[PDB]
């Protein structure tokens with residue numbers, strides 16, 4: 001019985017983000033080339049996946065957090081985390 | 091407890107695909123910048139992972155669906171989901 | 181019971197790596213345009229995630245292997261797999 005992780009990265013430094021689901025909550029550890037630190041992402045979830053893409057130099061991250069049959073999308077677009085439009089019928 | 095997801099994205103629109111393993115089957119939700127919709131992917135599996143790459147504007151997706159110790163690779167190369175050559179001796 | 185996988189890919193051949201957690205071990209299957217073959221990676225873990233990035237033509241891979249509350253990072257930077265600096269307090 002283990003924590004569950006999801007990871008994404010970008011650029012050539014690189015930056016890395018690792019999300020960990022643990023006892024119903026998801027937190028984030030970050031690397032920007034100069035040591036690991038705790039990130040701002042903090043949301044409910046028993047399961048996590050992540051994807052990200054660059055528009056020029058700007059990173060955009062989408063985290064999919066699931067509890068039961070409900071998946072919530074969280075969005076990073078250079079400012080804060082916001083709730084995304086994702087829905088599903090589970 | 092919960093469904094298990096995998097996500098991939100491409101381009102700068104972006105396009106996003108989210109695969110959800112729910113009670114033994116994997117389904118797909120799709121974003122191409124204009125609203126979420128249900129994709130054609132539907133395959134059995136308790137666990138899912140995904141990767142994708144672009145060739146110019148053409149997306150290629152590989153979904154790894156697992157039940158027990160058998161992982162089946164499903165391929166999108168523009169022309170419907172086809173069974174891939176992946177094997178593993180788990 | 182059912183194994184858990186994580187997948188990454190790079191280039192446009194492409195190269196693909198699929199990591200499978202089974203019976204407390206994470207193993208690796210590899211594709212680079214010929215056949216699937218078993219990779220060198222083999223480490224303890226009940227859960228796995230992965231990310232990778234190119235610097236020029238050189239691939240760098242990070243595998244996050246979790247057992248219980250402990251996530252260990254394994255790093256490929258062209259010459260072998262080495263333990264990474266990642267830490268967390270789960």
Ligand SMILES: CO[C@@H]1O[C@@H](C)[C@@H](O)[C@@H](O)[C@@H]1O
Pocket residue numbers: 017028030038039040041059061076
């Ligand atoms: C500067 O903010 C850091 O990087 C962003 C890309 C996000 O991962 C955020 O949660 C983190 O704290």
Ligand SMILES: CO[C@@H]1O[C@@H](C)[C@@H](O)[C@@H](O)[C@@H]1O
Pocket residue numbers: 062073075083084085086103104106121
């Ligand atoms: C612009 O809309 C935001 O970004 C898209 C890429 C999707 O993640 C969508 O659900 C989200 O609300």
Ligand SMILES: CO[C@@H]1O[C@@H](C)[C@@H](O)[C@@H](O)[C@@H]1O
Pocket residue numbers: 107118120128129130131149166
């Ligand atoms: C175009 O429609 C959507 O995009 C393809 C790339 C696949 O994800 C397919 O299953 C889905 O229906």
Ligand SMILES: CO[C@@H]1O[C@@H](C)[C@@H](O)[C@@H](O)[C@@H]1O
Pocket residue numbers: 152163165173174175176193194196211
């Ligand atoms: C051409 O072969 C197809 O694409 C490769 C990139 C692999 O995913 C392989 O297993 C699949 O059958």
Ligand SMILES: CO[C@@H]1O[C@@H](C)[C@@H](O)[C@@H](O)[C@@H]1O
Pocket residue numbers: 197208210218219220221239241256
């Ligand atoms: C050349 O070595 C192969 O490719 C590397 C990028 C790693 O995936 C390694 O485990 C594998 O055996």
Ligand SMILES: CO[C@@H]1O[C@@H](C)[C@@H](O)[C@@H](O)[C@@H]1O
Pocket residue numbers: 013014016031242253255263264265266
């Ligand atoms: C040089 O540092 C290595 O690469 C970084 C991108 C991180 O994965 C770090 O934990 C690892 O030790």
